[PDB]
């Protein structure tokens, strides 16, 4: 109703704008932002103001106007903020306050050339002594979802999802460079592979025309990866996006940024006190402060995380645990049932042993915390232990109940890795089509030998989520996937 | 073969080293690289390193064995270059020498621990005290394919392979820098997206189950970073992967980098001088010198660009060409067919006359050269020319034969990219099959209006090509598209 006669009234004025000339120039130019004369000129009075001639020209969108009758003022807002300017009849050119600038409406696009003062109230303004409409805005300026469908209109008006964006490009470049001073080499490994690997998860398929071959959308760097490795670049990593089909969820999207890391002579442990260095660098570089409010608690990434097995992480959730049924499938099997876990016929001992781990303990891990000792059985890339060869070398990273991040010792056998894929293989004939595929190639790369190594990754969503302050991963990503 | 003999022997080998105990430590230590010591103590003589105990620990690759019977030398090879062992048999434990060390074979991942000295050739060694195997190599070290395939082995032997891609790593790094200084936020848009835009290319279709949705890949970036400069981010850029479905050629990849930036109230002459500016700075601090050695041509990046339309680059490159056949459809149609082009029932004038500036022109621009005044048919996300509606404010960018990037002047014009849009639909219903799909958000987002903004992007595999003296763009790309 109300919102359709702005729509014709707005086209119309833009249609007028094309009848008398150019309705869409191109070439005004400004020397200055919003950030950058607050950043500058906050602090100074209206005697400095006014000895200093400074004049500037700013361009963004008028987002508020209050037209007094030959005096008016603005509410200018761009890249670094809003800054308020003075529109005056008599001190702009003949008609543009009259034919003009009293003809706009809220949300175009203009810019404004002036002197800088200070109003009553101390605040920083621009007197203009030149004033044009850059674009002309055919809407006027904006349930819950519909910000994630148009996130143009989300960052318009809260000025807390432009925070949350900006911090997470501010963090991505701090890993960035935490990752270079140490001697780590960023690569770009495919995006589309013949065969996925590295994780476990439905993998998009498409098809490729010019060759009539069927490929798989990346569900992990890793094994192209850990073959850089064995090329000799034994410091390297990739923050990049990885593509899974199984589902929307809060900490969930179909395509999501991950890093993973991968340097040569070490074991798990040197990944601990890099994952926790990380937290710290960001925290401190970042935010504040190594004190992170997130939700209702608060993270102190200058504290070590507190580390715990997965059995330990069992029993300590649910005391009421007999650790004896985890040395036995039907006991084991029987216990995911009482918890409510439906088993499926392809899992093992270790597998059922794993998810009782995510139903019992996961939701609880609260501060950051580690949890080693995996079973080999859902860990097929990882080293074998030395005193337990059914457990690997391996740690999950948790943070706020939710996994962050993953990393082990990578496996390094050749035949070990050879008869891992064989089992991946007989679980996706068994009816797991989350189960990792054979690659030859990767195994051929073994078998050139691959230094002892440690690998690390991290969903890159999840922690600028918790850097963010922000609970669901819709929040800290552009442009999600909906529900049409 | 002989090989599968070697093969065989190294896997029983292997074997043994299973029997006696562990045959995977993971646990050894190194704390130099070989381009560290190479570039603290290459400059000092025998006589300052006899008087300093200087002992380090180094891991890698044994690339050359020479046995002399109970002194040894060794060449050792890392991340950062090649050192040199000295194995004595009497300066290490009893029994390293001849019960392991004699045993070992070329390839092995090894680590040693000595004291630094000085050969009586003036080559950095160290005098090993300790040694042990990390890792046993089961086959042993290595034209045509093998490197593109197993690039594992090419990364190993040649070493021009290794530091064409370091200086890919510096490249990109260098980028990043280059536009944050500028002011410029990176960003992350889909990977995948409903409606695919931003160029024009067969895109890959897959589905996403939880959604029930056919899902394209990104063929561009262009129509969300914009989406993100309604928004108001008015400096954005991303350096991510695109794909397209096309084949395997001497300048193409089905996945392959792309840098996107888009700047508001700025024209297309901005981003030219952004570009000459790019260009020189990456040559200057990657290269150490403005001018660059590719294949047999020198490019100045202290030069500016020729610049050139693409009327200007038709009658340049074919003097014969009578310039009025290029404004009637039957003439420029006729005249393509002269020249070998196939033209296809959904092509329109402006289609013509561009398709046969690529059978001209193209090719013969070695130096790089800027070509503007593009027709609007081929241009659909461009701004409209003042003088000439039916060209465009745009450019191509060309380096060596091939196009580097293009750029242009956005267009913010609502009624314009809808009917441009409906001109593409127009085109895949006349069987172009790289014609754009309706976005109908993204009009939506111009009806919220943009400001005046200029854009840009640039292959950067193409980049790396012209920076590392590679001709194919296979050698640039770590693991390119093969055939099976
Ligand atoms: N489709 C779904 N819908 C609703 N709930 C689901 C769900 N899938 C799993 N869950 C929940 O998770 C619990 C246990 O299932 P898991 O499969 O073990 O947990 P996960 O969160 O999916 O981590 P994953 O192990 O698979 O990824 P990876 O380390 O290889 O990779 C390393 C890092 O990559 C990140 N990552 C992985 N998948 C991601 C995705 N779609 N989106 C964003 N980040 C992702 C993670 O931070 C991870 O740490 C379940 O009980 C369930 O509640
Ligand atoms: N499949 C094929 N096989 C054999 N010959 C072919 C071929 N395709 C084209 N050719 C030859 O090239 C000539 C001209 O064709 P064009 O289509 O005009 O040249 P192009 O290299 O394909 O640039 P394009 O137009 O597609 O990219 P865009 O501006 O959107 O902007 C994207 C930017 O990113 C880069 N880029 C685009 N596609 C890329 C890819 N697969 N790999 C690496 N970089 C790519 C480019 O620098 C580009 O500027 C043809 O006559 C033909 O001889
Ligand atoms: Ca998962
Ligand atoms: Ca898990
Ligand atoms: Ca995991
Ligand atoms: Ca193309
Ligand atoms: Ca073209
Ligand atoms: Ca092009």
Not at 234 to 259: A, C, D, K, L, Y
Not at 282 to 288: I, K
Request: glycine fraction near 6%; proline fraction near 4%.
């Amino acid at each position: 109703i109300d919102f359709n006669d702005e729509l014709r009234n707005r086209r119309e004025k833009l249609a007028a704008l094309r009848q008398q000339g150019v309705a869409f120039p191109n070439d005004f130019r400004r020397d200055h932002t919003s950030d950058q004369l607050h950043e500058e000129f906050d602090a100074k009075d209206n005697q400095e103001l006014e000895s200093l001639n400074i004049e500037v020209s700013v361009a963004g969108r008028m987002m508020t106007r209050r037209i007094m009758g030959k005096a008016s003022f603005v509410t200018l807002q761009d890249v670094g903020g809003r800054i308020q300017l003075y529109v005056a009849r008599d001190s702009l050119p003949e008609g543009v306050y009259n034919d003009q600038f009293k003809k706009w409406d809220l949300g175009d696009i203009i810019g404004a050339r002036g002197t800088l003062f200070k109003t009553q109230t101390g605040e920083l303004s621009i007197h203009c002594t030149e004033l044009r409409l850059l674009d002309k805005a055919l809407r006027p300026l904006p349930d819950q979802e519909v910000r994630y469908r148009q996130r143009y209109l989300d960052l318009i008006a809260n000025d807390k999802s432009r925070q949350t964006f900006v911090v997470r490009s501010k963090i991505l470049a701090a890993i960035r460079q935490f990752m270079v001073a140490r001697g780590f080499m960023e690569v770009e490994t495919p995006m589309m592979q013949v065969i996925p690997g590295g994780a476990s998860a439905r993998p998009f398929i498409t098809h490729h025309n010019a060759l009539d071959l069927d490929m798989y959308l990346r569900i992990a760097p890793e094994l192209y990866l850990k073959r850089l490795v064995v090329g000799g670049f034994e410091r390297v990593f990739e923050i990049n996006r990885n593509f899974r089909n199984e589902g929307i969820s809060v900490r969930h999207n179909p395509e999501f940024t991950m890093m993973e890391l991968y340097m040569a002579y070490a074991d798990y442990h040197d990944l601990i006190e890099l994952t926790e260095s990380l937290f710290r660098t960001l925290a401190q570089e970042v935010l504040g402060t190594t004190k992170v409010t997130y939700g209702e608690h608060v993270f102190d990434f200058g504290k070590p995380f507190e580390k715990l097995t997965m059995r330990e992480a069992i029993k300590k959730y649910r005391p009421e645990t007999d650790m004896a049924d985890l040395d036995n499938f039907d006991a084991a099997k029987a216990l995911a049932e009482s918890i409510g876990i439906t088993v499926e016929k392809s899992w093992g001992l270790g597998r059922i042993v794993t998810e009782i781990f995510d139903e019992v303990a996961e939701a609880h891990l609260i501060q950051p915390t580690f949890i080693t000792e995996y079973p080999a059985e859902v860990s097929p890339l990882a080293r074998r232990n030395d005193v337990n060869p059914e457990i690997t070398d391996r740690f999950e990273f948790f943070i706020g109940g939710r996994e962050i991040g993953n990393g082990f010792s990578e496996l390094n056998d050749a035949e070990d890795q050879a008869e891992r894929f064989q089992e991946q293989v007989n679980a996706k004939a068994a009816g797991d089509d989350e189960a990792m595929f054979y690659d030859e190639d990767y195994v051929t790369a073994l078998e050139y030998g691959l230094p002892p190594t440690a690998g690390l990754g991290i969903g890159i969503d999840r922690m600028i989520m918790l850097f963010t302050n922000s609970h669901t991963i819709r929040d800290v990503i552009l442009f999600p996937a909906m529900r049409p």
